[PDB]
Amino acid sequence: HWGYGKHNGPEHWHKDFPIAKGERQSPVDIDTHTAKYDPSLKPLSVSYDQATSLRILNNGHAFNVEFDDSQDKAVLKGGPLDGTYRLIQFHFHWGSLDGQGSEHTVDKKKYAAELHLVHWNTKYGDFGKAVQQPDGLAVLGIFLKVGSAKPGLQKVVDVLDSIKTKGKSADFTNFDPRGLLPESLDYWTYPGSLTTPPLLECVTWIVLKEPISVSSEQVLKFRKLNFNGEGEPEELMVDNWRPAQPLKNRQIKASFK
Ligand SMILES: CC(=O)/N=c1\sc(S(N)(=O)=O)nn1C
Ligand SMILES: [Zn+2]
Fold first, then answer.
1. Domains of the chain by residue range
2. What is the domain class of 1-257 according to CATH?
């Protein structure tokens, strides 16, 4: 099946998921001098005070922190969005070295990792229906650079030992995702897709300009996870990122000048 190895990596995905060569694939390089400042872009409204985190899971591709999305508890509005989007989960993509790891790039610069907060449009009823629509999802992307430690990320780091291998999960309650946001909410936005199979083109991307800083010790613990299941040959979970895809007929807009 698909993965990030040499025999099942991104360059092979198109064989089982032809949309891999679509017209609005993600991620992309954000060229800052080509981006169009759009004053018609509203500020983002992130309402995470009632968020209810439930569990943390190693799915063999990354680790996800899942939330209760049975009601409007953690929602994203405003920005380039029409309607209310509910937070369902968040996860990261990272590298084997501090010089790579992010999916999106800025003027070709790669960050150490990238955080993805996934939301789905409530007008569609369930996540499964949302992914089949062009405005189905809204993913908030945040870059991570290596520097000072991020206190609000340490609770996640500490629990990684318990979900080392594929399929493992652990209760993960009372985590506040507000601790993962940078000061400013200035962003870039463009229409795109999911960055791993099924690669559906149902995403409105909102990438924050301001990265968050994490310590080398924190990223190091991400790199100790495994792609493999327990009892199988150890394969380190690193470089689970898809390289930039052609922009084609798309315009990246900026909420700031
Ligand atoms: C359930 C869910 O969040 N799936 C996702 S999220 C996602 S991403 N990496 O945010 O574009 N890719 N896929 C397959
Ligand atoms: Zn992702």
1. 1-257
2. alpha beta
